[PDB]
């Protein structure tokens, strides 16, 4: 594909191939904590990953995915702002060229070192490819990463990155429990938005956790040793694969908490 994160094919350019890039419900956005409306009618999230079944980890070129077997009918996100049940299909991250940036969502303009996205599709549409064509097709759980103590549950992900350094490489990645990536609290903000990479489809109910996870400097630095390029090509370190905040327009961010 033409799009990427370079000066000439990066987010400022995506609209040429994907005109919805300038649409009405684009992601990510800045979350203004003063104006986000507390809604005490928002239910607790239900995150059930006990039966989530990881399969593989793959370098897609702009980031890496940890892919799950989404036939596992109890591996599910529901509750919160959602109707019905959503199946976990993959997770991935966005990160920066340094610790002071890398997140896609921002909180009062604050950028985190990275952001984790756990992607789920609405079972009422049969599969992921059908779900992305509907406004309520996906639910993405977003979790900020900040630098400090190490996150033990991330270690297996960061240690495997060496073996999938370049575009196209994959590795077995079974027995990975995504519960190890969740913070203590599930308090969240939610708003209707989009995929943050092309095709940028406006099919996503965003659920962004207020509480970041701490990861160590060494852990996040392993993200930056990945490469955009394929094997043999000239080294281009994979960094700054985040889309900046987009106009909120006529949307309301709600908060499940104070």
Nearer residue to Zn ion within complex by CB, 35 or 86: 86
Q: How far is the CB of 196 from Zn ion (least distance, A)?
A: 5
User: What is the DSSP code string of 22-40?
Assistant: GSSS-S--EE-TTTSEE-T
Closer residue to Cl ion (CB): 127 or 218: 218
Q: 87, 117, 167, 222: which one contacts Zn ion (CB under 5 A)?
A: 117
- Binding site members for substrate: 196-197
Residue 252's CB is within 10 A of a number of other CB atoms, namely 12
Q: Which stretch binds Zn ion (CB under 5 A): 24-32, 75-83, 113-121, 145-153?
A: 113-121
Query: What one-character DSSP code corresponds to residue 55?
Result: E
Contacts with Cl ion, 153-182, as mask; x by CB under 5 A: ------------------------------
In this complex, which beta carbon is closest to Zn ion, that of residue 1 or of residue 34? 1
Verify whether residue 62 is a known catalytic residue.
yes
Q: Which residue has the tokens 């990463």?
A: 145
Of residues 45 through 84, those in contact with Cl ion by CB under 5 A are: none
Q: What is the largest CA-CA distance in the chain?
A: 54
Q: Quick one: which segment of 79-87, 109-117, 178-186, 224-232 binds Zn ion (CB under 5 A)? A: 109-117
Looking at the Cβ atoms of 45 and 143, the one nearer to Zn ion is 143
218 binds, among Zn ion, Cl ion, none (CB under 5 to 8 A by kind): Cl ion
Known binding residues for Zn(2+) are 92, 94, 117
**Token digits for 219?**
């852990």
C-alpha distance from residue 76 to each of 69, 189, 258 (Å) = 12, 19, 26
For residue 78, count other CB atoms closer than 10 A to its CB.
17
The C-alpha atoms of residue 242 and residue 229 are separated, in whole angstroms, by: 17
How many residues can be counted in the chain? 258
* 177: partner contacted, choices Cl ion, Zn ion, none (Cβ within 5-8 A by kind): none
Decide whether 117 or 167 has the Cβ nearer to Zn ion.
117
Tokens of 130: 């059908």
Q: Contact 27/196 with Cβ under 8 angstroms?
A: yes
* Catalytic annotation, pick one of 13, 15, 62, 98: 62
Residue 219 contact partner, candidates Cl ion, Zn ion, none, CB within 5 to 8 A by sort of partner: Cl ion
> What's the distance, Cα to Cα, between the start and end of the chain in Å?
43
**Looking only at residues 201 through 220 of this chain, which bind Cl ion when binding is defined by CB under 5 A?**
218-219
Distance CA 122, CA 112 (A): 28
Q: Name the residues that contact Zn ion, by CB under 5 A.
A: 117
**Active-site annotation, residues:** 62
């Amino acid at each position: 594909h033409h799009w990427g994160f370079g000066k000439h094919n990066g987010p400022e350019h995506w609209h040429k191939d994907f005109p919805i890039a300038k649409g009405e419900r684009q992601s990510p956005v800045d979350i203004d904590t003063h104006t986000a409306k507390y809604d005490p009618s928002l239910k607790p999230l239900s995150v059930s990953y006990d039966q989530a079944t990881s399969l593989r980890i793959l370098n897609l070129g702009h980031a890496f995915n940890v892919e799950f077997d989404d036939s596992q009918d109890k591996a599910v996100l529901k509750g919160g702002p959602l109707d019905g049940t959503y199946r976990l299909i993959q997770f991935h991250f966005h990160w920066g060229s340094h610790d002071g940036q890398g997140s896609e969502h921002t909180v009062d303009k604050k950028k985190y070192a990275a952001e984790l996205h756990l992607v789920h599709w609405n079972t009422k549409y049969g599969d992921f490819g059908k779900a992305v064509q509907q406004p309520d097709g996906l639910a993405v759980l977003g979790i900020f990463l900040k630098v400090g103590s190490a996150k033990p549950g991330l270690q297996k992900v960061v240690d495997v990155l060496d073996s999938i350094k370049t575009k196209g490489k994959s590795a077995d990645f079974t027995n990975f429990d995504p519960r190890g990536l969740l913070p203590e609290s599930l308090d969240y903000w939610t708003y209707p938005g989009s995929l943050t990479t092309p095709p940028l489809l406006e099919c996503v109910t965003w659920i962004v956790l207020k509480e970041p996870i701490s990861v160590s400097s060494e852990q996040v630095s392993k993200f930056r040793k990945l490469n955009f390029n394929g094997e043999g090509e000239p080294e281009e370190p994979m960094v700054d694969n985040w889309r900046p905040a987009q106009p909120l327009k006529n949307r309301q961010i709600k908060a499940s908490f104070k």
